[PDB]
Amino acid sequence: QIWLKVCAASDMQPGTIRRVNRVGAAPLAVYRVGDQFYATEDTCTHGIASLSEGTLDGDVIECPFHGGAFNVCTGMPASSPCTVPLGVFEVEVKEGEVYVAGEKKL
Amino acid sequence: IWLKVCAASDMQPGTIRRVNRVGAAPLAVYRVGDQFYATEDTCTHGIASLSEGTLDGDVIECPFHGGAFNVCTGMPASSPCTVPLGVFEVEVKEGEVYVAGEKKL
Amino acid sequence: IWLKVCAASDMQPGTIRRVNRVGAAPLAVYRVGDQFYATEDTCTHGIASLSEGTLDGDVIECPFHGGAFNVCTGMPASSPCTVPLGVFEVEVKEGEVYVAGEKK
Amino acid sequence: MANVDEAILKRVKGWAPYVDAKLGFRNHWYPVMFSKEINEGEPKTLKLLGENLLVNRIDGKLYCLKDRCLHRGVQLSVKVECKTKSTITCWYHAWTYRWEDGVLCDILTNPTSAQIGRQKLKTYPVQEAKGCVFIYLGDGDPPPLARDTPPNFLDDDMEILGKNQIIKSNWRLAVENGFDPSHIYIHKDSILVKDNDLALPLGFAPGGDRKQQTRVVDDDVVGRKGVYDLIGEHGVPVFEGTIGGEVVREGAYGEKIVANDISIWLPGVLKVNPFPNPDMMQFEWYVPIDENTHYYFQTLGKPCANDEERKKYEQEFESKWKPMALEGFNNDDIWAREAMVDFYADDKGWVNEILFESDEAIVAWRKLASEHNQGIQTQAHVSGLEHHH
Amino acid sequence: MANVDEAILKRVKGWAPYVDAKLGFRNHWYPVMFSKEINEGEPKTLKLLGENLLVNRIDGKLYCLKDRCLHRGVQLSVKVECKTKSTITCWYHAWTYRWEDGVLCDILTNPTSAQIGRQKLKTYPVQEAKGCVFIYLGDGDPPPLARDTPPNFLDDDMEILGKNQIIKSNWRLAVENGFDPSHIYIHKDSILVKDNDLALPLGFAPGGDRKQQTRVVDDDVVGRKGVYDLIGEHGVPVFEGTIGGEVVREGAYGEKIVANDISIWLPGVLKVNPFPNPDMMQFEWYVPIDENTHYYFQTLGKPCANDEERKKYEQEFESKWKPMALEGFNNDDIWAREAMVDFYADDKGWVNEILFESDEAIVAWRKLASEHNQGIQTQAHVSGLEHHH
Amino acid sequence: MANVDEAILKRVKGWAPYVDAKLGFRNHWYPVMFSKEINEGEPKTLKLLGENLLVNRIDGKLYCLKDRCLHRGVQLSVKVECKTKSTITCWYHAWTYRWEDGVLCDILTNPTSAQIGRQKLKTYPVQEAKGCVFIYLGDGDPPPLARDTPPNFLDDDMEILGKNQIIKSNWRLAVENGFDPSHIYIHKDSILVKDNDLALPLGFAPGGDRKQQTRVVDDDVVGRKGVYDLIGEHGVPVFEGTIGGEVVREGAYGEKIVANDISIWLPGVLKVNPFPNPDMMQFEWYVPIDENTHYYFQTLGKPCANDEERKKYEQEFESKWKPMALEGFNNDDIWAREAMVDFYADDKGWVNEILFESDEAIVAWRKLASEHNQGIQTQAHVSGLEHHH
Ligand code: FES
Ligand code: FES
Ligand code: FES
Ligand code: FES
């Protein structure tokens, strides 16, 4: 579970979001900012919203519930009412394949 | 059947002319460009005289509350007006403007 | 009668200088461009010092409430000021600034 | 000036100033109390056109000062301190003003202050006439009181008796109800109509052109501005009210003919003659206190040639006219005014009202008031006029 | 329709129409009273969606007219004057309207007025069902009443009894509190719990995916639009509340199983089945009166085959159900609603609320309501629609 | 910011922050009650700087939590539920917080909820000193209490006794009235003057220049910021009040010399020494509750070396000082503050006030407060800080 198979870097266009469901664990969200990939918990820290259903503006994801937002790279809140940082998960591409860590950084 | 209002000359485009009728309520004649139209003079929303209002295109605005009507159809154009205005047939036979005694059905 | 305030060059354009007079109310000398004017220094609406205010053209804005006066006529230019300011004619002779001792 | 949503004022082109005059018209005289209500050396407080005022009687003469200290804006009346016959001292820091011209003549807490003799508390002209106290809520030299009073009110032989109280409605609703030709309907069951055998129709079926429905007076020998309701000149009195052809109500078939001479005058006073009896007259003011309240200053006049008739009149007034007419008749006007508050409260009623024929009288008043008022009282006049650049 | 700051509506992309519906949804049926409260020829007043209305019973049939005269906007109810069986006459200038179509048919103060037969007072459809009075606060021919009722309410054998009152909170706070799965916690000490030996958990530990938490109904043959709360299908009911691992509270271990089927339906009526008894059902509406108040229209349903059973039910209603349930149980819902007023009063609560799992049910409702409501009531609807071109 | 019309703030360039601080200054310590008023496990509610707070004493120590559940924003105090000694459980959906750090540690309605341990209710530092409860309404680590207390209040031997109440006026009007040199005039008839043989002038005739009128303290090592009123150093006290040169009122010629050392300190606490007796001191706070009210936290300090002395002082406080000074003297300050409400309520008084010489002290305070306050409390702080990417 260290590295989770997401998809081919080819399956994602710049500025898109993908939800990664995990057995017995909370979902993750993978964002493609250009040719780089990032990932955080999928659930907004302000409620029960799914960030994968939000709007990505550059490196900032906006929650579809209340307009709160986070920086997808650091997981830090970017817009109120969000105040709790998101857990960030490492993403690496091996053989044009996208992988996300099973455990968050720290 | 018809009443002589005035000469198409006496009316500049974009102006209104009140036509009083003995034994009946007043009417208003509007010149929108080169065509003429006629309706009741009294606003359906109260007791204002539309001839004292402001004409903008084919829409006349009442001086009392700002309600308005389309002078061609007589249909309300702006609130608070809700009751359509009575429209009358107009004719310009030989530079002379005429208005029908009764509203066009 | 007349009081020597200072050399014209002692004041940069658009600045104000307070002139104290023993046994009398202080005055404010304003330099609008290369012109000089003088009025009472105390705002007529309170205890503010107009010399610590903002000069906008020929109008002085009080630092307390934003009231204002035309430093040339002394008449209020902005509320809440309502009582006209005392104005003093100023004389600039040989680059020297002098102000009348009494309002006029 | 600027009391109502600009979008609403734009719509009411016939009388925008009137609709804007929420707080009343400045630069006019207004009755606020009766002479007997204010005694020598006993200051009285009141609010007029939204302004708190103080009135005092010194050596028999009335004086009026704004009830707001220039210093920190407190009402002097919270704790009146008249330390000398000609002055009043603020209870807070002792700023002292002269009743005569409002000049700040002393400051007990600092006798060396540069403010002394350099500030003036607002004063307003005050005049007593017919036992009534009028205040000129305006600036500069006041015009003759006659300008702002209905014809004959100041007649030498006219004996005036009345009542005053505060009513919860904007002053304009009161004015319009009073001058409303068809509002008579609310009086159909009044005790006065029966107990004084008055003839009272339910309303009027208008006759003639609308120009003939009213008579506007643009100028009297004294500059009066007003409108006469002439609906009864060519109109047909309605004595039988029908619904679907069936008679459901009847007017009063009394012998006494009254109120066939009705006029409204700026700043807002109604004259009904004769009323409530063929030999009497009623003059009533609707004085703005604030945007939600007004003084309903009622007066009944009757010519009297001597102390005898005056004494007799005052007896009839207290025993009959006051309770039967001023109260028994006019009480219905009070709740009718209150009933229009909600509709006009958001200023939307001035656009949504649906008028009918008899309202030509009200329309004439709104236009006259809009064209000849001497100024619009604004909230700024209340807090302090403001202007920048 | 702009009832809230645009900045806030822009933030709540999932249910903006709902957040904007502070005054309720127009074009829906709403219960406002019980049939037995409105008697023949006795007009009754009430406010619905901010509009003052008058309801009258004529020949057994109900009629609804807006309680605001077209003329000067006064409420006709200030002094009701129904002079003929089919009409009502305004007490002010006698404009007379027909109850069946609102047409201005007569004017006693001026029978020759051109307004007669040309103006129309707003009317609203009224329908009685299950001893409840429903008013269609909307325009045009009304849809079937069943569209705006929860399933089974109109069942032939369903005996409906209840109570209604005015509560001080916006209708939405009442709805959400009602459909809120986890709010059961506030009922843990209700007398109904012990006195009716109810099984009642403290909360629910969710199970399954988001979609499984509810069943959204937007394909109901009757047109009904609503949501079913299915939290208890995959979760685990909480019967032992713990803090730090230590049990501090327990749910009710009674035998009677209740409220296992809960659903909310537009325009805002909750159905709880079975409740308060395993053989009964509860139907309650949260009707908008104005932005700060709503009617809490409670009803209890119990099948009855004969008048004999209907009495037994009625008796237990009065002696047990109404006292022990509608009040003993639901009174805590009342102050719970009131407790949320401050947070949402400035509309900021709609942005700052921090939701948890069980609120998935509330979210479903907000989305359903936002997508299937038949119109947003606005203050303009209350004062008078405004438009230009 | 966003508390006052920008147009007004632009006009008061000398103290805009102060004029904008209608809700008080954030990040300062404020006394809100006396220690003996908050007992073990007996949560108390209070509003400070517009925020609803809950205070509780557990194992003798005080803890402060915002009285607003993070879930649906209700006040936890509507129905306090302290299930365990170290926690409080919202009565609505049972979200449970620890008094010690506000961490959401449990949720009785959903033990599996993902919110558990990932949300935190706002907490504020609380400290007891001299029998007074101080709350640091600010963010981050608080500064020493000493910074927000006037000199000597924290002295080892200073015995503090007091009284607290809610007063209907903005806190700034209270601060200015207290530091106002000339307001002494309102106390000329106080029972304390005669009953305690006080020497009390009616006011002061200032002397020297502006800078000499006060001493601005911004160099204090403990960090306290304040201003000393030195009007009496070069000014002549007024004992004979005159109007037109004639004596109309005299000051008090008592033997006891008091209040010759007056100072105001941020966040808004006045120190009058010595008062009400030559061997005592008075320290009073005007704590902002909301825009229209404040706590008038009065304390009288007197050196005591043992229980026998402090017990004697307490008896004297209850029998004399409290009724004769705190009430007998200061009650006039209360209505004086209230009298200024109307003028400043619309924020216009901050522009229209006409100041005189002694107000130099108030101006100094306004400037000090504007420059050294630790933050402007805003409505956003109350509802929830806002920031958009
Ligand atoms: S749930 Fe994401 S901002 Fe509120
Ligand atoms: S009378 Fe014409 S808009 Fe009202
Ligand atoms: S002291 Fe100058 S504007 Fe007020
Ligand atoms: S408020 Fe009147 S003298 Fe100060």
Ligand code: FES
């Ligand atoms: S307000 Fe109803 S008839 Fe005039």
Ligand code: FES
């Ligand atoms: S509002 Fe407190 S737990 Fe829901």
Ligand SMILES: [Fe+2]
């Ligand atoms: Fe009347």
Ligand SMILES: [Fe+2]
């Ligand atoms: Fe409930």
Ligand SMILES: [Fe+2]
């Ligand atoms: Fe004091």
